[PDB]
Amino acid sequence: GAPATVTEQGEDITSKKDRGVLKIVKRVGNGEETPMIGDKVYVHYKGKLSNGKKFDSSHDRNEPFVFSLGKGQVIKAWDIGVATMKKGEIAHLLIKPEYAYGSAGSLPKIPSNATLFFEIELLDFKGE
Numbered sequence: 001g002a003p004a005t006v007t008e009q010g011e012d013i014t015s016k017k018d019r020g021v022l023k024i025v026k027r028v029g030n031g032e033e034t035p036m037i038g039d040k041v042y043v044h045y046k047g048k049l050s051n052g053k054k055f056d057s058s059h060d061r062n063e064p065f066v067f068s069l070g071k072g073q074v075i076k077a078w079d080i081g082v083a084t085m086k087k088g089e090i091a092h093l094l095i096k097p098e099y100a101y102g103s104a105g106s107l108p109k110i111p112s113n114a115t116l117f118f119e120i121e122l123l124d125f126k127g128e
């Protein structure tokens with residue numbers, strides 16, 4: 001499935017090169033520009049735990065998910081990943097626990113040492 005394809009073909013977009021965040025572009029976006037730190041960013045996404053026990057979607061609540069890039073408002077993997085994305089881009093990320101909820105997890109929703117998978121669409125970004 002999509003997670004396995006990322007684990008095999010996905011590009012390592014971490015600075016440390018520890019394969020903590022792997023990316024595949026699934027639909028190529030418009031323009032050359034990607035968002036800067038501090039940009040207000042608008043996305044739709046679907047996400048799941050590797051263990052299969054929890055799934056989440058913006059689409060579920062039908063409304064775009066909005067956050068300020070690079071401010072740690074989301075897990076580190078998103079600050080890294082969404083910064084590589086162009087407007088209109090859809091991407092897959094596979095994320096080791098160190099770039100998500102770590103050894104502590106975020107119980108009861110996320111267990112300790114969880115791997116996460118996301119499908120993300122970058123709708124738009126604006127400068128603060």
Ligand SMILES: COc1cc([C@@H](C(=O)N2CCCC[C@H]2C(=O)OCc2cnn(CCO)c2)C2CCCCC2)cc(OC)c1OC
Pocket residue numbers: 047048049054055056067073074075078106109110116
């Ligand atoms: C850990 O808590 C959460 C995790 C997540 C999901 C998640 O891990 N993320 C949500 C989308 C942004 C990336 C990442 C995250 O940073 O979640 C924490 C988060 C949720 N909202 N925000 C901004 C508001 O402070 C940050 C997670 C994906 C795996 C399947 C179960 C849920 C969604 C949540 O609310 C919808 C959430 O509760 C606040």
